[PDB]
């Protein structure tokens, strides 16, 4: 990250062994379940591109996923170099990725006025690649999630929203899915209660009504 | 590492017991699997040569690998003393290795303007030796990696890129390997799908196509 030096001006400070051990543990345990993206973004707060690259390099195994990540960052960086023309200099996409700049340039861009926040721009590209990975590691479509005849309605809500969180579809589709699919894919007992409530109920009303049903 | 003193000027601060315990754990567990190099470089950020030597000395066992490392650092340091003539003084290769200088000289060189970054120069030599070690501890050529008739295409991508990450070959050869060998060494079912895609597909397209094939 960047922090205030002895002179008060901002300077880089190393990503701690505890943060790296935490990230390594996160990816070793949770294997691109969607909470890995919030955990990455929380662990990587204020990170320079060198800190982001350090986190991603410490990932052991998962090398198919990490190649899907690198080809995404290539696609995002090429889009950046298509978007931004050529005239601190303006960073090229390879500079934002930390591939063609020093760390001193990254401190420069991140501390300029107005800032050129290469740490956040690059973290957006990494998170967009981690998204593509998480949706591919998700084994089921939201269309596949149904409640069993003997399954509690809370364990179906938990499976449904845990799957919905990993869907690609736009927020208009996720809204429609929560309203229509949550009613329709419940088992006939619970679905009868949810049809007696109707389309207008909140998730609290639907869960408290189907409690023990 | 080096950090700002009470006078604001840079001075050395000891490599913490948590960093040393982390490095000892890394080398005890992961035994020069390639992630040991990013872990070394992350744990060793801002390290003086005395800090680098302290990390390498704490490695228990692996003494064959550590001798391959010392003979590499000798080769790199001899190349440095061949490259740089004799006129802070300019550091000799033995000074960059921390073998023939005080720590005060290392702080001097690292805080001079322009810097003489003996901590990074030496960390390059150490990482280049850790590379030679990692490629020797890697048990299989990339030519040996093939998909089994009953093996999922993601577990073959994972084995392939985890092996490719430890190949010596130039990036032109690794590019050619990802394109040609990734198609050719797949099992005939998956390879049929990859030949139906052709040479142009991304790793995401190849994995999503061979999913459950």
């Amino acid at each position: 990250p960047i922090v205030q030096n002895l002179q008060g001006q901002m300077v880089h400070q190393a990503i701690s062994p505890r943060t790296l051990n935490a990230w390594v543990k996160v990816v070793e345990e949770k294997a691109f379940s969607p909470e890995v993206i919030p955990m990455f973004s929380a662990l990587s707060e204020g990170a320079t591109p060198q800190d982001l690259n350090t986190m991603l390099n410490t990932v052991g195994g998962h090398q198919a996923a990490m190649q899907m990540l690198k080809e995404t960052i290539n696609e995002e960086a090429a889009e950046w170099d298509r978007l931004h023309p050529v005239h601190m200099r303006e960073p090229r996409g390879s500079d934002i990725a930390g591939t063609t700049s020093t760390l001193q340039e990254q401190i420069g861009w991140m501390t300029h006025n107005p800032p050129i926040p290469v740490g956040e721009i690059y973290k957006r590209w990494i998170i967009l690649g981690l998204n593509k990975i998480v949706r591919m590691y998700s084994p089921t479509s939201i269309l596949d999630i149904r409640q069993g005849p003997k399954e509690p309605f809370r364990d179906y809500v938990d499976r449904f929203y845990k799957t919905l969180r990993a869907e690609q579809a736009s927020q208009e589709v996720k809204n429609w899915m929560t309203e229509t699919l949550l009613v329709q894919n419940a088992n006939p007992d619970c679905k009868t209660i949810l049809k007696a409530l109707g389309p207008g109920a909140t998730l609290e009303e639907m869960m408290t009504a189907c409690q023990g049903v | 590492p080096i950090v700002q003193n009470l006078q604001g000027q840079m001075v050395h601060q000891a490599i913490s017991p948590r960093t040393l315990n982390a490095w000892v754990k890394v080398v005890e567990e992961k035994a020069f699997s390639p992630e040991v190099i990013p872990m070394f470089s992350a744990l060793s950020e801002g390290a003086t040569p005395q800090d680098l030597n302290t990390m390498l000395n704490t490695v228990g066992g692996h003494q064959a690998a550590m001798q391959m490392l010392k003979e590499t650092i000798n080769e790199e340091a001899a190349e440095w003393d061949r490259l740089h003539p004799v006129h802070m003084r300019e550091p000799r290769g033995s000074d960059i290795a921390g073998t023939t200088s005080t720590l005060q000289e290392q702080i001097g060189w690292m805080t001079h303007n322009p810097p003489i970054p003996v901590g990074e120069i030496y960390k390059r030599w150490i990482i280049l030796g850790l590379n030679k070690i990692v490629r020797m501890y890697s048990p299989t050529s990339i030519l040996d990696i093939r998909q089994g008739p009953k093996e999922p295409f993601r577990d073959y991508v994972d084995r392939f890129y985890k092996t490719l990450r430890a190949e010596q070959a130039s990036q032109e050869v690794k590019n050619w390997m990802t394109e040609t060998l990734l198609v050719q060494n797949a099992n005939p079912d998956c390879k049929t799908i990859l030949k139906a895609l052709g040479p142009g597909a991304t790793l995401e397209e190849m994995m999503t196509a061979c999913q459950g094939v």
């Binding site: 690259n53 991603l56 290539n74 | 890129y161 190949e167 690794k174």
Partner: peptide
């Protein structure tokens, strides 16, 4: 592209 297939993140 900035990140080649066998290459670590951030390159050399």
């Amino acid at each position: 592209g900035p990140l080649l297939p066998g290459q670590s993140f951030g390159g050399p």
